[PDB]
UniProtKB/Swiss-Prot annotation, chains A, B, C:
This is Sigma-C capsid protein. GO terms for biological process: symbiont entry into host cell; virion attachment to host cell. The chain holds residues 120 to 326 of 326 of the full protein. It is found in: Virion. One of its GO terms (cellular component) is viral capsid. Belongs to the orthoreovirus sigma C protein family. It comes from the Viruses. Disulfide bonds: none annotated.
């Protein structure tokens, strides 16, 4: 019985030792899993996580998904409004422009035609387009604001008008002085005080 | 020996107790790892997973990668075909248009010129362009279908023609009535029954 | 005491057995965690990982983020340079072009006008624009190289000029023969040896 107990004790010792080795294996295996690189992955914008789902956040004016990342899903608009333009050099006059702005994705294309005459005093005129001078400002006013990248440079503008019964047309340029205001510069077809009529302006911006 | 066995038993008890505490530590540590947030991350379109690899799925007509996400990789096409256009108001006639469609990324730019005369009966005419009236329909017909976003609005179209030995040219507008059919509306340069010739149409769509 | 030791031994055996079952549970639970799918996720371009952060890598000429993935952030440029163009069929002459290149995102729009006369010998002329013939090559020369996708096709070019006191204007086409060289083809308004002047070229490329 002392001998029987001693044999039982030797058996227990063996089992305890097995358990001890199984616990050392589990300790190593759990050490790995605690350090696995994929734990604490995070996602910077335009990637985001909500309830375990990783998403690409998409500006619908620029892109969308149809399985794959493709172009804009937002509805195009053709806005129609009146914009009073201001002579800001070579003219102190104003002129009403009937404006169609075709907004498709983040491109806004302007087609403008004037009503009335603009009095000019020099051979070149600067004509300013400030969002505050728009009558019945559209809802999606964001469609009329150029992006910061677009604003950094002058952009091409087609201009045409009549003066003293003759048509003039020029490839000219505009530039934004701020996010709400651009000015175009164009020749007036002559010198001195005169009136130009049937002013048309065609240009486009990236918003 | 009873005393020796009792000392051995006290030693085993101590070892069993250590094992027990090592197992409680492992149980807590495994509880953490079972709940780690990064487990069961999923990826919604345009993101996808295949064999552990997370990818951005890219429409090659819109974007591609050159390390960074950049613009289209698909080859531009210049398609040339004949499109029979239909007078649908102010005309019951038809006219064959020779069409160059310049497809670059998801922009398709149309340059059309007519062969023949179109009989008009009013001062304004509606001219319809249905994909079914294209002769030798191109392979990439998808390049001639506007996106849902683009279809939501009228879009600018340049039109010019001759009538009674005089040129006319107008900035006009088209609109899609369905994904396969657009109609342009333009003045005819006069009134009554007449024939216009040398019709040219320039416009573009987002696909 | 033999009986007391035997009772202690039976108690230890019970504890060892509990420990053994707790270790088998932990072994199974650790087996799961070792195989979890989210372990060893990787990210293919334009997705990337740095220090646990997953990012969308963005070409700033094409896209940016303002929370959501939107259009370009790079500053637009209006470049002005002189490009000597080469007659390469129907002319052996050269002509200096004053070029405005409006670079907005990955679109580059060219507005060119000539200084001088170009001698032509046929009714059609090919005029070549090689980046090596640009005087004072701009810094961002990449803005003048079409993308591989754009190069695959001919593209529309507007051309106008004067010849013998009369204006001519044509919708024409260019094509890249390599990434640095495009040629435009246009009618010369007549036949035989003559001089054209006031050449203007308007076209655009995707870069
Ligand atoms: Cl004993
Ligand atoms: Cl144990
Ligand atoms: Zn013995
Ligand atoms: Zn894990
Ligand atoms: Zn006034
Ligand atoms: Zn003792
Ligand atoms: Zn007919
Ligand atoms: Zn007993
Ligand atoms: Zn020469």
């Amino acid at each position: 019985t002392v001998d029987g107990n001693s044999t039982a004790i030797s058996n227990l010792k063996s089992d305890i030792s097995s358990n001890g080795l199984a616990i050392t294996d589990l300790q190593d295996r759990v050490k790995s899993l605690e350090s696995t690189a994929s734990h604490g992955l995070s996602f910077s914008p335009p990637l985001s996580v909500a309830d375990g789902v990783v998403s690409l956040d998409m500006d619908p004016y620029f892109c969308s998904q149809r399985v794959s990342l493709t172009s804009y899903s937002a509805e195009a608009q053709l806005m129609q409004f009146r914009w009073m333009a201001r002579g800001t050099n070579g003219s102190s006059d104003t002129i009403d422009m009937t404006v169609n702005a075709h907004c498709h994705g983040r491109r806004t294309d302007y087609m403008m035609s004037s009503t009335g005459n603009l009095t000019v005093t020099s051979n070149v005129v600067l004509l300013t387009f400030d969002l505050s001078d728009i009558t019945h400002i559209p809802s999606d006013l964001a469609r009329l604001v150029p992006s910061a990248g677009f604003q950094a440079a002058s952009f091409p503008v087609d201009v045409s008008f009549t003066r003293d019964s003759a048509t003039h047309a020029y490839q000219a340029y505009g530039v934004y002085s701020s996010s709400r205001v651009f000015t175009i510069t164009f020749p007036t077809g002559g010198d001195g005080t005169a009136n130009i009529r049937s002013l048309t302006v065609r240009t486009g911006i990236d918003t």
